[PDB]
Write a protein that binds this ligand. Structure first.
Ligand SMILES: O=C(N[C@H](CO)[C@H](O)c1ccc([N+](=O)[O-])cc1)C(Cl)Cl
Ligand SMILES: O=C(N[C@H](CO)[C@H](O)c1ccc([N+](=O)[O-])cc1)C(Cl)Cl
Ligand SMILES: O=C(N[C@H](CO)[C@H](O)c1ccc([N+](=O)[O-])cc1)C(Cl)Cl
Ligand SMILES: [Co+2]
Ligand SMILES: [Co+2]
Ligand SMILES: [Co+2]
Ligand SMILES: [Co+2]
Ligand SMILES: [Co+2]
Ligand SMILES: [Co+2]
Lengths: 213, 213, 213
């Protein structure tokens, strides 16, 4: 299948996993500022657009780390081989959003073909989930482009066993020499530590700072 | 009455409303910095005081948007025609707070008469709710004037169907050329999207930037 | 014993206490930036290290205020005479953390002897709680040294009657003339108001700004 059954008895965080999944169920959010000065220059010298690039770069970082691709399936801890981004789409006419997903690809050009195509087919589709059920192997990416925020947190009544990372971006802004993007990351404590979140962000910063292709 | 029964079957966010009210109950908070450089100048050239002005400006923005005045009454979704601010009051002697409310008025001078009068009557009243029950048509405004914060979030055990926006301000501070006020907004996802929150903040920023009268 | 039964009927926040402990159970988090320019200079001129100093200074501020040392014991509200820090320890080999605690002492040198000794004994102990049960009189201190954050919030499924403050620090960073440390404080509303949190932070800032000995 497109996942592997994870070895829970020989894993180093096995005590942690049960602690934060059942004894003390919890998660955490942290918002950090990502330096997008270099990425703006690269976007500038290409035909790619900001949102799709951020989706692609977020999914790329997510797909490099096992702990951000965890889930429970048939009462077992699995690791997705790969995850596809589920992102929000604003409808300026209705002032409502839809949530769309498209296959992740390592090739940035193929990713762009996927995004545009799905963006093509459901552009004016105001259902909350135009495509139907959300793929099991997903990551959530949202965007708040109209306002800059220093912090964002989702207060959820019931989060038992939902391990997919929640990522939210705000409007970027010039802070002296740098163009900074606020990025909120919300994770479940059973599968992720502060280290795992820092790693992802640091990795995401690297990617912003590198050639697109 | 002072409210209108909202048309839920012909509303564009009807799927959203049920999704986030029952399938996935949740809310979110975001803290943004409001530029109060212009407002400080206007306060300077008047006799008005900062807290009352912020209460008045917050209630004014809130009263312009339907989605921030929503509630459930007799198991139905209503929109308040208008809402009155319920704000916190610090008692320096006891080191405790009370929560007071006063009628909103479009006329800033009449608002000030209301605030001073209620502030007059319950100045030394250390009950948590001096006035009695909190009016159904309300908004919550709190202030933390002793410390600046980049983020604030209320972790509530049970928030089912409480749709009134929660607004919290921190101590303002000079960030170069600007006087910035941290403002945390906490809302329920059933009635508000990220767009609706951005709109409010952008509108609030406009108001700070305009004549008081 | 090492605690005193608190006088709930003659306390000024008694209505507040029941309100936020049972009628409206909730807490809040706030992240503020602590100016550590002065502390860096003092660390520089000594042999002490940053994490241990921050633990010591956090526990010192906490031990000055009753409301941050509250608990329920045998269904009664107690105040700990004193609390010991429980802090996280990263294991670079396994990439997992443990939580350790050591006795608080007013003497900074004795504190350092305690920390090093416990750090000595369980350096390579990868259990989540190497020492066993966590002392009842504790405070939680965590650190995220790999990334800077503007906000941090723990989303906990069940927090009834746990009154110990949760403090989390991020990687510090140069913001012009200042070295700023992000510090998230998470508290239960029954025992702490915004005032009580501001007071702690202001007190913590003072301590950073003062001689170590
Ligand atoms: O609800 C969704 N997204 C919103 C958009 O504002 C938000 O990002 C969110 C994501 C996950 C979530 N959860 O899993 O509890 C709650 C809200 C998607 Cl699942 Cl459609
Ligand atoms: O509790 C109140 N205010 C506090 C003050 O610190 C805070 O602003 C708050 C507001 C709303 C709330 N809620 O609705 O769950 C909880 C806390 C008012 Cl309802 Cl009196
Ligand atoms: O879980 C713990 N610490 C984590 C570390 O990331 C976090 O600081 C935390 C603290 C308290 C908590 N709680 O009491 O619900 C939850 C998480 C300690 Cl109790 Cl070991
Ligand atoms: Co279990
Ligand atoms: Co792979
Ligand atoms: Co329903
Ligand atoms: Co009107
Ligand atoms: Co009770
Ligand atoms: Co003492």
């Amino acid at each position: 299948m497109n996942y592997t059954k994870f070895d829970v008895k020989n894993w180093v965080r096995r005590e942690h996993f049960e602690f934060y999944r059942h004894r003390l169920p919890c998660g955490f959010s942290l918002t950090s500022k990502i330096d997008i000065t270099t990425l703006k220059k690269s976007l500038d010298d290409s035909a790619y657009k900001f949102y799709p690039v951020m989706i692609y770069l977020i999914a790329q970082a997510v797909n490099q780390f096992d702990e951000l691709r965890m889930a429970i399936k048939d009462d077992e801890l699995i690791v997705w081989d790969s995850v596809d981004p589920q992102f929000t789409v604003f409808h300026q006419e209705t002032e409502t959003f839809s949530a769309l997903s498209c296959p992740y690809s390592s090739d940035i050009d193929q990713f762009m073909v996927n995004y545009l195509s799905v963006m093509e087919r459901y552009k004016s589709d105001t259902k909350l989930f135009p495509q139907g059920v959300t793929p099991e192997n997903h990551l959530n990416i949202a965007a708040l482009p109209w306002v800059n925020f220093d912090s964002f947190n989702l207060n959820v009544a019931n989060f038992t066993d939902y391990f997919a990372p929640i990522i939210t971006m705000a409007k970027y802004q010039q802070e002296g020499d740098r163009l900074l993007l606020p990025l909120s990351v919300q994770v479940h404590h059973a599968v992720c530590d502060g280290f795992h979140v820092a790693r992802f962000i640091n990795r995401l910063q690297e990617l912003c700072n590198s050639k697109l292709k």
